[PDB]
């Protein structure tokens, strides 16, 4: 019967593959089929929408590849009598202000970013690094609000625990992926020869991993590096390696909730004109490291590791 879209900007990340698996579980429970389309750039996004109107879909969940496409995605969907829910990244108007009217499902970004900052400082104390030869590398993507609130929340926590403000160095990355973050961290590294230990701050696992691979290339051994990712499911290949590395752990939020919950809310609204709440913030988070990753994921239902 009913066909609903689930469009994601980055199908390569296990984060979005998980949302897709859980949207499928909601289609089997509620009686709808989920059409799964990758939308890595804005042209594919707008095309994908035409494509869903041709398959007869009545609505879609989307994680847009650029928040500034919001108006266009809304104009096209209104065009085809399709309801829209945004997952993870909020639509913004042309001036950059949030479009408050499309229902949104996202993580509590500031709170998880603060947890990241508090865990970096606890591991730094466990290792006993001297703060005078340590520094924070913060890889930022400030044009995306969800990314910006996670890195600022993390820098803010670090400064609140007492890490010196002037030894916090920010560098923007051009893409939210390993090659982008690598290039960014590499450029920051050669500018600071005085630093003997680094904390790496990034909004997600791929961003922290690019950071860590750059440090390795510049001769830091793992004891001198601490990076902690966000997404959990994306760091399982790192945490499964024989050897420990500078990537110490990752904060596991709930992509299963993002996937099923937005897909069930879209269906209630398409099928019973039941209006979704405008804003749903998911606060779940657990620290996974090489010691508990397998247990914690099996415990959240994401079995295998
Ligand atoms: O909501 C969490 C989600 O936030 C953004 O969309 C990131 O690019 C993803 O990798 C994921 O971390």
Swiss-Prot record:
TM regions (residue ranges): none
Induction of expression: Induced by arabinose. Transcription is dependent on the transcription factor AraC, the cAMP receptor protein (CRP) and cAMP.
Regions annotated as coiled coil: none
Subcellular location(s) per record: Periplasm
Top-level taxon in the UniProt lineage: Bacteria
A Gene Ontology BP annotation from the UniProt entry: L-arabinose transmembrane transport
A Pfam short name: Peripla_BP_1
InterPro entries the UniProt entry points to: AraF, Bact_Solute-Bind_Prot2, Peripla_BP/Lac1_sug-bd_dom, Peripla_BP_I
Residues marked The binding site for the sugar molecule has not yet been established, but C-87 may be involved (site): 63
Keywords: Periplasm, Signal, Sugar transport, Transport
GO molecular-function term, one example from the UniProt record: ABC-type monosaccharide transporter activity
Coarse class of the protein's main subcellular location: periplasm
GO cellular component annotations of the record: ATP-binding cassette (ABC) transporter complex, substrate-binding subunit-containing; membrane; outer membrane-bounded periplasmic space
The family this protein is said to belong to: Belongs to the bacterial solute-binding protein 2 family.
Function: Involved in the high-affinity L-arabinose membrane transport system. Binds with high affinity to arabinose, but can also bind D-galactose (approximately 2-fold reduction) and D-fucose (approximately 40-fold reduction).
Protein name per UniProt: L-arabinose-binding periplasmic protein
Organism: Escherichia coli (strain K12)
Gene symbol of the encoding locus: araF
């Amino acid at each position: 019967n009913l066909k609903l879209g689930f469009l994601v900007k980055q199908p390569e990340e296990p984060w979005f593959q998980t949302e897709w698996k859980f949207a499928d579980k909601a289609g089997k429970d509620l009686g709808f089929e989920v059409i799964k389309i990758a939308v890595p750039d804005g042209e594919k996004t707008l095309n994908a929408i035409d494509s869903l109107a041709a398959s007869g879909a009545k609505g879609f969940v989307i994680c847009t590849p650029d928040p500034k496409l919001g108006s266009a995605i809304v104009a096209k969907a209104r065009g085809y009598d399709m309801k829209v829910i945004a997952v993870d990244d909020q639509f913004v108007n042309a001036k950059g202000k949030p479009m408050d009217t499309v229902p949104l499902v996202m993580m509590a970004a500031t709170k998880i970013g603060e947890r990241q900052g508090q865990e970096l400082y606890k591991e730094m104390q466990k290792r006993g690094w001297d703060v005078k030869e340590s520094a924070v590398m913060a890889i930022t993507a400030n044009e995306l609000d969800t990314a910006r609130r996670r890195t600022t929340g993390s820098m803010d926590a670090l400064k609140a625990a007492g890490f010196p403000e002037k030894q916090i160095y920010q560098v923007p990355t051009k893409s939210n992926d390993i090659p982008g973050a690598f290039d960014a961290a590499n450029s920051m590294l050669v500018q600071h020869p005085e630093v003997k230990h680094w904390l790496i701050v990034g909004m997600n696992d791929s961003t922290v991993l690019g950071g860590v691979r750059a440090t390795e290339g510049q001769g830091f051994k793992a004891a001198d590096i601490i990076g902690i990712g966000i997404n959990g499911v994306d760091a399982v290949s790192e945490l499964s390696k024989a050897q420990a590395t500078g990537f110490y752990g990752s904060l596991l939020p709930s992509p299963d909730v993002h996937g099923y919950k937005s897909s069930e809310m879209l269906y209630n609204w398409v099928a019973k004109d039941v209006e979704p709440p405008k804003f749903t913030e998911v606060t779940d988070v657990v620290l996974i490291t090489r010691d508990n990753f397998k247990e914690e994921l099996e415990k959240k239902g994401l079995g295998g590791k």
